[PDB]
Amino acid sequence: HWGYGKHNGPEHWHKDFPIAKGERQSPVDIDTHTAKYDPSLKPLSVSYDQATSLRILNNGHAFNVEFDDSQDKAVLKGGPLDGTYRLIQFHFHWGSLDGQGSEHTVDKKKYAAELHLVHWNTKYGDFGKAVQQPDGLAVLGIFLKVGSAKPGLQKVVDVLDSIKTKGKSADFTNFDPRGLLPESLDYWTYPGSLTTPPLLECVTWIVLKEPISVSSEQVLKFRKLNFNGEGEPEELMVDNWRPAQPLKNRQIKASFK
Numbered sequence: 001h002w003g004y005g006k007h008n009g010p011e012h013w014h015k016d017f018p019i020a021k022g023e024r025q026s027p028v029d030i031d032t033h034t035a036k037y038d039p040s041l042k043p044l045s046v047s048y049d050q051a052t053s054l055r056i057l058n059n060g061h062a063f064n065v066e067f068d069d070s071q072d073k074a075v076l077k078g079g080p081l082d083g084t085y086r087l088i089q090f091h092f093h094w095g096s097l098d099g100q101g102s103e104h105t106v107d108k109k110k111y112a113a114e115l116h117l118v119h120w121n122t123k124y125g126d127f128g129k130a131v132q133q134p135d136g137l138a139v140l141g142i143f144l145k146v147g148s149a150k151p152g153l154q155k156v157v158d159v160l161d162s163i164k165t166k167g168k169s170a171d172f173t174n175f176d177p178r179g180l181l182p183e184s185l186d187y188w189t190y191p192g193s194l195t196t197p198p199l200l201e202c203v204t205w206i207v208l209k210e211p212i213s214v215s216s217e218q219v220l221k222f223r224k225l226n227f228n229g230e231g232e233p234e235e236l237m238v239d240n241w242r243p244a245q246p247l248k249n250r251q252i253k254a255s256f257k
């Protein structure tokens with residue numbers, strides 16, 4: 001099955017998921033000089049006051065912090081979006097070294113990690129229906145740089161020991177995702193895809209310009225997770241990012257001057 005190694009990583013995915021070579025794949029490099037400010041874009045509305053976290057799961061590729069998405073509790077709207085998109089989960093992609101890990105890049109710069117807050121368009125009723133639609137998902141992407149600690153990330157770092165291996169999960173109620181946001185909601189936006197198989201082309205990407213700072217100890221802790229299951233030889237969960245893909249016939253728009 002697919003993964004991030006030499007033998008089953010991003011260069012191989014197209015054999016089981018041919019859309020890997022499609023017209024709207026993610027991530028991409030954000031060329032800041034080529035992205036045009038779009039004065040018709042709206043501010044983003046991130047409404048997380050009522051977010052209900054439930055569980056954190058090591059799925060063998062990343063860890064997912066999952067939310068109750070059976071009602072409009074934590075939603076994203078505005079920005080480039082029509083309609084209301086419900087938060088279902090967030091996860092990260094990160095590197096074995098602080099110089100690499102993000103999936104999007106900015107003028108070819110890689111950050112140490114990238115947070116993806118995944119939301120689905122409520123007009124489609126559930127997540128599995130939404131991923132069959134070109135406007136089914138909205139993913140808010142936030143870069144992590146290593147510097148000062150991010151206090152709102154520490155409860156996630158604290159629990160990773162309990163979900164070290166593939167298929168482990170733990171209670172993760174009462175987590176406020178507002179503590180993972182940077183100060184500014186200035187963003188770039190473009191149409192793309194999931195960045196892991198099945199690589200579906202359903203995503204409006206909204207990538208914040210301002211990274212959050214995390215400490216070197218926080219990201220070290222991410223790197224102690226395992227891809228493998230319990231009882232299997234240890235494979236550190238690191239470098240679970242897909243490199244930038246061809247932009248093709250797409251424009252990246254900026255919300256800011």
Ligand SMILES: Cc1cc[nH]c(=S)c1
Nearest residue numbers: 116118139194195196
């Ligand atoms: C929905 C989904 C799942 C895994 N990864 C990403 S970027 C998005």
Ligand SMILES: [Zn+2]
Nearest residue numbers: 091093116195
């Ligand atoms: Zn992701």
